[PDB]
Amino acid sequence: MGPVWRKHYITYRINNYTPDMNREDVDYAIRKAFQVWSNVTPLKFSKINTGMADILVVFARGAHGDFHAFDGKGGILAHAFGPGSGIGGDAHFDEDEFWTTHSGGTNLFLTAVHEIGHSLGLGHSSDPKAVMFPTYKYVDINTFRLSADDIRGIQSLYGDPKE
């Protein structure tokens, strides 16, 4: 067993914004990415704009204070820390990527779903169909669905939604 959030009500806050997409689009990509996970577990996600959140969403480039320096455009697109206190649960996106609403470059929604998986406690999958597969790949955001491995992985940690 590994660390999990010990409550079902989880807050997130967007620390700062990429200049690559307007605010509405960043907010929606992130909201929609939490929604993918909340759809298959008992978890509830809420955005806050003040106070300390459980999960901080940050856009940063190169070294940014966590011993895990980003590496410019390409390579690592983002990273996240599992459930814990302090930096635990936070999701960092490499500001050097070009973030898009679709496939124009690095899709934020898809990348966020993968990172939130990490913030919830999931590690990598060996199933090429899984969002937790280590390698980024675009899929139409209207056609996107967690794979069966993602769902069983997340439910083993938090159970399924209630009656």
Ligand SMILES: O=C(O)C[C@@H](O)CCc1ccc2c(c1)Cc1ccccc1-2
């Ligand atoms: O957190 C990490 O492991 C580092 C990161 O560069 C991997 C980002 C990533 C990894 C995998 C995927 C995506 C993004 C988007 C996607 C859509 C559909 C299926 C898989 C993936």
Ligand SMILES: [Ca+2]
């Ligand atoms: Ca990078």
Ligand SMILES: [Zn+2]
């Ligand atoms: Zn970081």
Ligand SMILES: [Zn+2]
């Ligand atoms: Zn990953």
